[PDB]
Amino acid sequence: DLPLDPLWEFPRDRLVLGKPLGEGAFGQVVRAEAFGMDPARPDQASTVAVKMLKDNASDKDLADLVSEMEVMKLIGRHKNIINLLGVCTQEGPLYVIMECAAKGNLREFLRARRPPGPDLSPDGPRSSEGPLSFPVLVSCAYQVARGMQYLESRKCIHRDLAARNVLVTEDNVMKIADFGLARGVHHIDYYKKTSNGRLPVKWMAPEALFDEVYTHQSDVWSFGILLWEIFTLGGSPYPGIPVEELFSLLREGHRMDRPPHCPPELYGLMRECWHAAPSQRPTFKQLVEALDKVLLAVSE
Ligand SMILES: *C(=O)c1nc2c(C(=O)Nc3cc(O[C@H](C)c4c(Cl)cncc4Cl)c(C#N)cn3)cn(CCN3CCOCC3)c2cc1Br
Protein backbone atom coordinates (compact mmCIF):
# COMPACT_ATOMS: atom_id res chain seq x y z
CA ASP A 1 0.00 0.00 0.00
CA LEU A 2 3.13 2.14 0.08
CA PRO A 3 3.75 3.97 -3.22
CA LEU A 4 5.54 1.98 -5.93
CA ASP A 5 9.11 3.04 -6.69
CA PRO A 6 10.11 1.07 -9.83
CA LEU A 7 13.69 2.33 -9.46
CA TRP A 8 14.26 0.31 -6.28
CA GLU A 9 11.39 -2.20 -6.24
CA PHE A 10 12.41 -5.86 -6.21
CA PRO A 11 10.09 -8.87 -6.62
CA ARG A 12 9.85 -10.44 -3.15
CA ASP A 13 9.44 -13.89 -4.72
CA ARG A 14 13.02 -13.60 -5.95
CA LEU A 15 14.15 -13.70 -2.31
CA VAL A 16 14.77 -16.80 -0.22
CA LEU A 17 14.93 -15.82 3.45
CA GLY A 18 17.57 -17.61 5.50
CA LYS A 19 19.04 -17.42 8.99
CA PRO A 20 18.49 -14.23 11.02
CA LEU A 21 21.58 -12.07 11.56
CA GLY A 22 20.45 -9.80 14.36
CA GLU A 23 17.83 -7.37 15.60
CA GLY A 24 17.86 -3.62 16.39
CA ALA A 25 15.71 -1.13 18.37
CA PHE A 26 13.28 -1.30 15.42
CA GLY A 27 13.54 -4.05 12.78
CA GLN A 28 15.31 -7.38 12.42
CA VAL A 29 17.88 -8.31 9.80
CA VAL A 30 17.81 -11.67 8.02
CA ARG A 31 20.33 -13.27 5.66
CA ALA A 32 18.80 -14.17 2.29
CA GLU A 33 19.48 -15.36 -1.24
CA ALA A 34 18.52 -13.06 -4.11
CA PHE A 35 18.00 -14.14 -7.71
CA GLY A 36 18.56 -11.59 -10.46
CA MET A 37 19.47 -8.57 -8.33
CA ASP A 38 21.46 -7.71 -11.43
CA PRO A 39 18.69 -7.45 -14.07
CA ALA A 40 21.22 -8.56 -16.70
CA ARG A 41 21.49 -11.94 -14.97
CA PRO A 42 17.91 -12.83 -13.86
CA ASP A 43 18.81 -16.33 -12.61
CA GLN A 44 22.05 -15.39 -10.85
CA ALA A 45 22.14 -15.98 -7.10
CA SER A 46 23.58 -13.53 -4.57
CA THR A 47 23.63 -13.23 -0.78
CA VAL A 48 21.90 -10.17 0.65
CA ALA A 49 20.80 -8.79 4.01
CA VAL A 50 17.06 -8.16 4.35
CA LYS A 51 15.73 -5.82 7.01
CA MET A 52 12.09 -6.12 8.01
CA LEU A 53 9.72 -5.19 10.81
CA LYS A 54 9.71 -7.49 13.85
CA ASP A 55 6.58 -9.31 15.05
CA ASN A 56 3.64 -7.18 16.22
CA ALA A 57 5.46 -4.00 15.18
CA SER A 58 4.10 -0.56 16.11
CA ASP A 59 3.22 2.19 13.66
CA LYS A 60 6.34 4.06 14.77
CA ASP A 61 8.44 0.99 13.99
CA LEU A 62 7.06 1.05 10.44
CA ALA A 63 7.67 4.80 10.18
CA ASP A 64 11.28 4.34 11.33
CA LEU A 65 11.94 1.59 8.79
CA VAL A 66 10.32 3.63 6.02
CA SER A 67 12.48 6.56 7.12
CA GLU A 68 15.58 4.37 6.96
CA MET A 69 14.58 3.19 3.48
CA GLU A 70 14.31 6.72 2.10
CA VAL A 71 17.68 7.70 3.57
CA MET A 72 19.21 4.65 1.85
CA LYS A 73 17.80 5.85 -1.47
CA LEU A 74 19.25 9.35 -1.09
CA ILE A 75 22.66 8.41 0.29
CA GLY A 76 23.97 7.04 -3.02
CA ARG A 77 26.57 4.32 -3.49
CA HIS A 78 30.00 4.12 -1.86
CA LYS A 79 32.53 1.32 -1.36
CA ASN A 80 32.80 1.83 2.39
CA ILE A 81 29.13 1.88 3.39
CA ILE A 82 26.32 -0.68 3.40
CA ASN A 83 24.52 0.05 0.14
CA LEU A 84 20.83 -0.27 -0.65
CA LEU A 85 20.18 -2.95 -3.27
CA GLY A 86 16.39 -2.92 -3.50
CA VAL A 87 13.08 -2.81 -1.64
CA CYS A 88 9.88 -4.83 -1.35
CA THR A 89 6.85 -2.65 -0.64
CA GLN A 90 4.13 -4.17 -2.82
CA GLU A 91 1.67 -6.89 -1.78
CA GLY A 92 3.44 -8.14 1.34
CA PRO A 93 5.61 -7.06 4.29
CA LEU A 94 8.11 -4.21 3.91
CA TYR A 95 11.59 -5.42 2.97
CA VAL A 96 14.70 -3.25 2.85
CA ILE A 97 17.35 -5.16 0.89
CA MET A 98 20.99 -4.18 1.45
CA GLU A 99 24.51 -5.54 1.05
CA CYS A 100 25.58 -8.43 3.27
CA ALA A 101 29.00 -8.46 4.96
CA ALA A 102 30.26 -12.02 5.31
CA LYS A 103 32.59 -11.47 8.28
CA GLY A 104 30.21 -9.67 10.65
CA ASN A 105 30.99 -6.41 12.43
CA LEU A 106 34.44 -4.91 12.97
CA ARG A 107 34.52 -5.50 16.73
CA GLU A 108 33.92 -9.26 16.53
CA PHE A 109 36.22 -9.44 13.49
CA LEU A 110 39.11 -8.08 15.56
CA ARG A 111 38.33 -10.01 18.76
CA ALA A 112 38.30 -13.34 16.92
CA ARG A 113 41.68 -12.50 15.38
CA ARG A 114 43.72 -11.55 18.44
CA PRO A 115 47.31 -12.89 18.34
CA PRO A 116 48.04 -16.37 19.76
CA GLY A 117 48.83 -16.21 23.46
CA PRO A 118 52.31 -17.20 24.68
CA ASP A 119 50.62 -20.22 26.28
CA LEU A 120 50.46 -21.85 22.85
CA SER A 121 52.93 -24.56 21.84
CA PRO A 122 55.20 -23.32 19.00
CA ASP A 123 54.01 -25.20 15.91
CA GLY A 124 55.33 -24.05 12.54
CA PRO A 125 57.47 -21.19 11.23
CA ARG A 126 55.14 -18.29 12.16
CA SER A 127 53.78 -19.37 15.59
CA SER A 128 53.90 -15.81 17.05
CA GLU A 129 52.36 -14.36 13.92
CA GLY A 130 48.67 -13.56 14.31
CA PRO A 131 46.10 -12.84 11.56
CA LEU A 132 46.17 -9.09 12.24
CA SER A 133 49.06 -6.83 11.27
CA PHE A 134 49.63 -3.09 11.74
CA PRO A 135 49.10 -1.97 8.12
CA VAL A 136 45.78 -3.84 7.91
CA LEU A 137 44.58 -2.21 11.14
CA VAL A 138 45.52 1.17 9.66
CA SER A 139 43.68 0.27 6.46
CA CYS A 140 40.55 -0.59 8.44
CA ALA A 141 40.68 2.84 10.10
CA TYR A 142 41.32 4.53 6.75
CA GLN A 143 38.33 2.85 5.09
CA VAL A 144 35.98 3.84 7.91
CA ALA A 145 37.19 7.44 7.58
CA ARG A 146 36.63 7.46 3.81
CA GLY A 147 33.15 6.03 4.32
CA MET A 148 32.37 8.65 6.94
CA GLN A 149 33.74 11.37 4.67
CA TYR A 150 31.29 10.24 1.99
CA LEU A 151 28.40 10.21 4.46
CA GLU A 152 29.37 13.70 5.63
CA SER A 153 29.37 14.97 2.03
CA ARG A 154 25.82 13.64 1.82
CA LYS A 155 24.83 15.58 4.95
CA CYS A 156 24.44 12.35 6.92
CA ILE A 157 25.24 12.11 10.63
CA HIS A 158 25.70 8.63 12.11
CA ARG A 159 25.14 9.50 15.84
CA ASP A 160 26.49 6.12 16.97
CA LEU A 161 29.70 5.43 15.06
CA ALA A 162 31.46 2.39 16.56
CA ALA A 163 33.25 -0.92 15.70
CA ARG A 164 29.90 -2.77 16.20
CA ASN A 165 28.33 -0.53 13.47
CA VAL A 166 31.16 -1.20 10.97
CA LEU A 167 30.79 -4.35 8.86
CA VAL A 168 33.49 -6.48 7.23
CA THR A 169 33.09 -8.07 3.79
CA GLU A 170 34.70 -11.27 2.50
CA ASP A 171 37.51 -9.13 1.08
CA ASN A 172 38.01 -7.29 4.39
CA VAL A 173 36.38 -4.09 3.12
CA MET A 174 34.99 -1.87 5.88
CA LYS A 175 31.34 -0.95 5.40
CA ILE A 176 29.60 1.51 7.71
CA ALA A 177 26.13 0.28 8.67
CA ASP A 178 23.02 1.82 10.26
CA PHE A 179 23.98 5.41 9.39
CA GLY A 180 20.54 6.75 8.48
CA LEU A 181 18.67 5.63 11.58
CA ALA A 182 16.28 7.26 14.01
CA ARG A 183 17.92 6.56 17.36
CA GLY A 184 15.65 8.53 19.71
CA VAL A 185 18.27 11.05 20.80
CA HIS A 186 15.86 12.81 23.17
CA HIS A 187 15.25 9.66 25.22
CA ILE A 188 18.53 7.80 25.67
CA ASP A 189 19.02 5.54 28.68
CA TYR A 190 22.68 6.37 29.30
CA TYR A 191 22.92 3.46 31.75
CA LYS A 192 21.53 0.95 29.25
CA LYS A 193 23.79 -2.04 28.65
CA THR A 194 23.24 -4.11 25.51
CA SER A 195 22.87 -7.89 25.51
CA ASN A 196 26.54 -8.17 24.51
CA GLY A 197 27.57 -5.82 27.30
CA ARG A 198 28.00 -2.61 25.31
CA LEU A 199 27.47 0.82 26.87
CA PRO A 200 26.73 3.07 23.84
CA VAL A 201 27.17 6.21 25.97
CA LYS A 202 30.94 5.64 25.82
CA TRP A 203 30.89 6.60 22.12
CA MET A 204 29.02 9.89 22.56
CA ALA A 205 30.74 13.24 22.12
CA PRO A 206 30.41 15.59 25.14
CA GLU A 207 28.18 18.02 23.22
CA ALA A 208 25.97 15.06 22.28
CA LEU A 209 25.84 13.56 25.77
CA PHE A 210 25.50 16.80 27.74
CA ASP A 211 23.81 19.16 25.27
CA GLU A 212 22.06 16.75 22.87
CA VAL A 213 23.90 18.40 19.97
CA TYR A 214 24.94 16.27 16.99
CA THR A 215 27.28 17.41 14.22
CA HIS A 216 29.77 15.70 11.92
CA GLN A 217 32.41 16.67 14.48
CA SER A 218 30.51 14.68 17.09
CA ASP A 219 30.95 11.69 14.76
CA VAL A 220 34.67 12.50 14.67
CA TRP A 221 34.76 12.05 18.45
CA SER A 222 33.08 8.67 17.95
CA PHE A 223 35.65 7.84 15.27
CA GLY A 224 38.37 8.47 17.84
CA ILE A 225 36.78 5.88 20.11
CA LEU A 226 36.54 3.55 17.12
CA LEU A 227 40.26 4.11 16.53
CA TRP A 228 40.88 2.96 20.10
CA GLU A 229 38.75 -0.14 19.47
CA ILE A 230 40.74 -1.09 16.38
CA PHE A 231 44.16 -0.88 18.02
CA THR A 232 42.97 -2.66 21.15
CA LEU A 233 41.76 -5.32 18.70
CA GLY A 234 38.11 -5.01 19.70
CA GLY A 235 38.46 -3.80 23.28
CA SER A 236 35.77 -1.96 25.24
CA PRO A 237 36.48 1.78 25.79
CA TYR A 238 37.04 3.29 29.26
CA PRO A 239 37.95 -0.10 30.79
CA GLY A 240 36.22 -0.87 34.08
CA ILE A 241 34.52 2.51 34.23
CA PRO A 242 30.78 2.50 34.99
CA VAL A 243 28.49 5.13 33.43
CA GLU A 244 28.25 7.19 36.65
CA GLU A 245 32.04 7.50 36.81
CA LEU A 246 32.15 8.23 33.07
CA PHE A 247 29.99 11.31 33.65
CA SER A 248 32.26 12.92 36.25
CA LEU A 249 35.45 11.92 34.42
CA LEU A 250 34.25 13.52 31.18
CA ARG A 251 33.32 16.69 33.09
CA GLU A 252 36.91 16.70 34.37
CA GLY A 253 38.14 16.29 30.79
CA HIS A 254 39.44 12.76 31.33
CA ARG A 255 40.60 10.81 28.28
CA MET A 256 41.52 7.18 27.64
CA ASP A 257 45.15 6.13 28.06
CA ARG A 258 47.41 5.14 25.19
CA PRO A 259 46.79 1.42 24.54
CA PRO A 260 49.67 -1.09 24.37
CA HIS A 261 51.38 -1.72 21.01
CA CYS A 262 49.94 1.51 19.62
CA PRO A 263 52.29 3.97 17.87
CA PRO A 264 52.17 7.63 19.01
CA GLU A 265 50.89 8.72 15.58
CA LEU A 266 47.58 6.92 16.04
CA TYR A 267 47.06 7.79 19.71
CA GLY A 268 47.78 11.33 18.55
CA LEU A 269 44.86 11.09 16.12
CA MET A 270 42.68 9.67 18.90
CA ARG A 271 43.40 12.60 21.21
CA GLU A 272 42.76 15.05 18.37
CA CYS A 273 39.33 13.48 17.87
CA TRP A 274 38.71 13.87 21.60
CA HIS A 275 39.51 17.59 21.76
CA ALA A 276 36.84 19.35 23.84
CA ALA A 277 36.04 21.97 21.20
CA PRO A 278 34.49 20.33 18.09
CA SER A 279 36.31 22.79 15.82
CA GLN A 280 39.60 21.63 17.36
CA ARG A 281 38.95 18.08 16.18
CA PRO A 282 40.09 17.07 12.68
CA THR A 283 37.53 16.75 9.90
CA PHE A 284 36.98 13.34 8.32
CA LYS A 285 38.71 14.68 5.21
CA GLN A 286 41.77 15.45 7.35
CA LEU A 287 41.50 12.05 9.03
CA VAL A 288 41.48 10.34 5.64
CA GLU A 289 44.59 12.24 4.55
CA ALA A 290 46.39 11.70 7.86
CA LEU A 291 45.63 7.97 7.87
CA ASP A 292 46.61 7.82 4.20
CA LYS A 293 50.11 9.11 4.98
CA VAL A 294 50.56 6.44 7.64
CA LEU A 295 49.12 3.75 5.35
CA LEU A 296 51.38 4.67 2.43
CA ALA A 297 54.37 4.77 4.77
CA VAL A 298 53.75 1.17 5.85
CA SER A 299 52.79 -0.38 2.46
CA GLU A 300 56.29 -0.68 0.82
C1 LIG B 1 26.10 -12.13 4.44
O1 LIG B 1 27.19 -11.61 3.69
C2 LIG B 1 26.53 -12.53 5.71
N1 LIG B 1 26.44 -11.69 6.75
C3 LIG B 1 26.86 -12.07 7.96
C4 LIG B 1 26.88 -11.42 9.12
C5 LIG B 1 26.44 -10.17 9.28
O2 LIG B 1 26.60 -9.58 10.35
N2 LIG B 1 25.82 -9.71 8.18
C6 LIG B 1 25.25 -8.50 8.10
C7 LIG B 1 24.63 -7.86 9.18
C8 LIG B 1 24.04 -6.61 9.01
O3 LIG B 1 23.43 -5.90 10.01
C9 LIG B 1 23.26 -6.55 11.28
C10 LIG B 1 22.01 -6.00 12.00
C11 LIG B 1 24.37 -6.41 12.13
C12 LIG B 1 24.80 -7.55 12.82
CL1 LIG B 1 23.97 -9.04 12.59
C13 LIG B 1 25.88 -7.49 13.68
N3 LIG B 1 26.56 -6.29 13.87
C14 LIG B 1 26.14 -5.15 13.19
C15 LIG B 1 25.04 -5.20 12.33
CL2 LIG B 1 24.57 -3.74 11.52
C16 LIG B 1 24.04 -6.02 7.75
C17 LIG B 1 23.44 -4.75 7.54
N4 LIG B 1 22.97 -3.74 7.37
C18 LIG B 1 24.64 -6.67 6.68
N5 LIG B 1 25.23 -7.92 6.88
C19 LIG B 1 27.38 -12.20 10.07
N6 LIG B 1 27.68 -13.36 9.48
C20 LIG B 1 28.27 -14.54 10.15
C21 LIG B 1 29.72 -14.33 10.57
N7 LIG B 1 30.38 -15.64 10.76
C22 LIG B 1 30.79 -15.83 12.16
C23 LIG B 1 31.46 -17.19 12.32
O4 LIG B 1 32.61 -17.27 11.45
C24 LIG B 1 32.21 -17.11 10.07
C25 LIG B 1 31.55 -15.75 9.89
C26 LIG B 1 27.36 -13.28 8.19
C27 LIG B 1 27.47 -14.16 7.19
C28 LIG B 1 27.05 -13.80 5.91
BR1 LIG B 1 27.18 -15.01 4.47
XYZ file of N, CA and C and ligand atoms in Angstrom, residues 20-24 28-29 31-33 47-49 51 68 82 98-106 113 163-168 170 177-178, ligand 1:
147
model
N 18.427 -15.587 10.480
C 18.485 -14.225 11.020
C 19.908 -13.832 11.401
N 20.248 -12.561 11.221
C 21.581 -12.074 11.557
C 21.574 -11.347 12.898
N 20.556 -10.545 13.113
C 20.454 -9.796 14.364
C 19.228 -8.923 14.391
N 19.018 -8.244 15.504
C 17.834 -7.367 15.600
C 18.235 -6.039 16.245
N 17.573 -4.954 15.854
C 17.864 -3.615 16.393
C 16.736 -3.071 17.245
N 14.412 -6.226 12.345
C 15.315 -7.385 12.418
C 15.949 -7.575 11.045
N 17.158 -8.079 11.038
C 17.885 -8.312 9.797
C 18.103 -9.802 9.554
N 19.564 -12.861 6.830
C 20.330 -13.268 5.660
C 19.384 -13.866 4.623
N 19.670 -13.647 3.344
C 18.803 -14.165 2.293
C 19.531 -14.334 0.968
N 18.999 -15.213 0.129
C 19.479 -15.358 -1.237
C 18.610 -14.528 -2.174
N 23.994 -13.275 -2.191
C 23.632 -13.233 -0.780
C 23.428 -11.794 -0.324
N 22.254 -11.522 0.234
C 21.903 -10.174 0.654
C 21.398 -10.160 2.091
N 21.351 -8.970 2.678
C 20.795 -8.792 4.011
C 19.452 -8.082 3.908
N 16.288 -6.372 5.791
C 15.730 -5.816 7.014
C 14.214 -5.734 6.898
N 14.284 4.947 7.275
C 15.584 4.367 6.957
C 15.693 4.069 5.468
N 27.313 0.316 3.785
C 26.323 -0.684 3.397
C 25.334 -0.056 2.423
N 19.661 -4.829 1.483
C 20.991 -4.177 1.449
C 22.126 -5.190 1.314
N 23.340 -4.681 1.179
C 24.511 -5.538 1.045
C 24.763 -6.342 2.316
N 25.271 -7.557 2.144
C 25.583 -8.425 3.271
C 27.098 -8.535 3.439
N 27.569 -8.375 4.672
C 28.998 -8.460 4.963
C 29.322 -9.788 5.638
N 30.081 -10.624 4.939
C 30.256 -12.025 5.314
C 30.986 -12.248 6.641
N 31.764 -11.269 7.091
C 32.590 -11.471 8.281
C 32.067 -10.761 9.533
N 30.816 -10.309 9.492
C 30.207 -9.671 10.648
C 30.761 -8.283 10.911
N 30.549 -7.764 12.119
C 30.992 -6.408 12.427
C 32.472 -6.343 12.792
N 33.013 -5.129 12.786
C 34.444 -4.914 12.966
C 34.942 -5.336 14.348
N 40.388 -12.443 16.062
C 41.678 -12.503 15.382
C 42.808 -11.912 16.216
N 32.756 0.327 16.309
C 33.253 -0.924 15.700
C 32.097 -1.894 15.422
N 31.097 -1.924 16.304
C 29.904 -2.775 16.201
C 29.018 -2.349 15.016
N 29.097 -1.090 14.596
C 28.325 -0.526 13.471
C 29.162 -0.463 12.193
N 30.326 -1.096 12.197
C 31.157 -1.205 10.971
C 31.175 -2.677 10.559
N 30.851 -2.968 9.315
C 30.794 -4.353 8.865
C 31.959 -4.715 7.953
N 32.341 -5.988 7.980
C 33.490 -6.477 7.226
C 33.065 -7.471 6.148
N 33.843 -10.110 2.707
C 34.703 -11.273 2.500
C 36.106 -10.858 2.064
N 27.526 0.693 8.667
C 26.127 0.284 8.667
C 25.295 1.138 9.616
N 23.981 1.133 9.396
C 23.024 1.825 10.256
C 23.350 3.305 10.439
C 26.095 -12.133 4.444
O 27.195 -11.608 3.692
C 26.528 -12.529 5.707
N 26.444 -11.689 6.745
C 26.857 -12.066 7.965
C 26.882 -11.420 9.123
C 26.439 -10.175 9.282
O 26.603 -9.576 10.346
N 25.819 -9.709 8.179
C 25.248 -8.500 8.096
C 24.633 -7.863 9.180
C 24.040 -6.614 9.006
O 23.428 -5.897 10.005
C 23.257 -6.550 11.284
C 22.011 -6.004 11.997
C 24.370 -6.413 12.133
C 24.795 -7.549 12.817
Cl 23.966 -9.040 12.590
C 25.885 -7.494 13.680
N 26.562 -6.288 13.873
C 26.135 -5.149 13.190
C 25.044 -5.203 12.329
Cl 24.572 -3.736 11.523
C 24.040 -6.021 7.747
C 23.442 -4.747 7.540
N 22.969 -3.738 7.369
C 24.641 -6.674 6.682
N 25.234 -7.923 6.884
C 27.379 -12.203 10.073
N 27.683 -13.358 9.482
C 28.266 -14.544 10.151
C 29.722 -14.333 10.572
N 30.377 -15.636 10.761
C 30.793 -15.827 12.157
C 31.465 -17.186 12.322
O 32.608 -17.270 11.447
C 32.213 -17.105 10.070
C 31.554 -15.746 9.889
C 27.362 -13.280 8.187
C 27.468 -14.159 7.189
C 27.048 -13.800 5.911
Br 27.181 -15.011 4.469
